[PDB]
């Protein structure tokens, strides 16, 4: 589990979104496994605005933050998981590392802020849903 809290936005994995998230929906995209809902309270996370390919992610299933290199956001074929069939997922970045279903929502961060959240895992790879192209999170 996990979210990003920026301004009056909450960013979560679409497959973990709550009723309150859908009841306060701003934007959602199945292909990216992302959903954004509106918040009453201001959040304090900063979204990275950059093309970094190195950062650190949180892996809840190891209680550890791991430094990783990660690929550029792309359309990646993902094997079936407990929460999606095998499919193409867009705006996804891969690293070599551990990721189980419960790790979804863990933050990937670089020097500029939050890059994205864990979304995929298996075959010794971790996949992160990028948020750096969602420039509207910074405003309004
Ligand atoms: Zn960066």
From Swiss-Prot:
**Which reaction(s) does the protein catalyse, per the Swiss-Prot or TrEMBL entry?**
Selective cleavage of Tyr-|-Gly bond in the picornavirus polyprotein
Q: Which residues form the active site?
A: 15, 33, 104
Binding of Zn(2+) 1, residues: 50, 52, 110, 112
Q: What does this protein do?
A: Cysteine protease that cleaves viral polyprotein and specific host proteins. It is responsible for the autocatalytic cleavage between the P1 and P2 regions, which is the first cleavage occurring in the polyprotein. Also cleaves the host translation initiation factor EIF4G1, in order to shut down the capped cellular mRNA translation. Inhibits the host nucleus-cytoplasm protein and RNA trafficking by cleaving host members of the nuclear pores. Counteracts stress granule formation probably by antagonizing its assembly or promoting its dissassembly.
How does this polypeptide assemble, per the annotation? Homodimer.
Protein name as annotated: Protease 2A
Species of origin reads Coxsackievirus A16 (strain G-10)
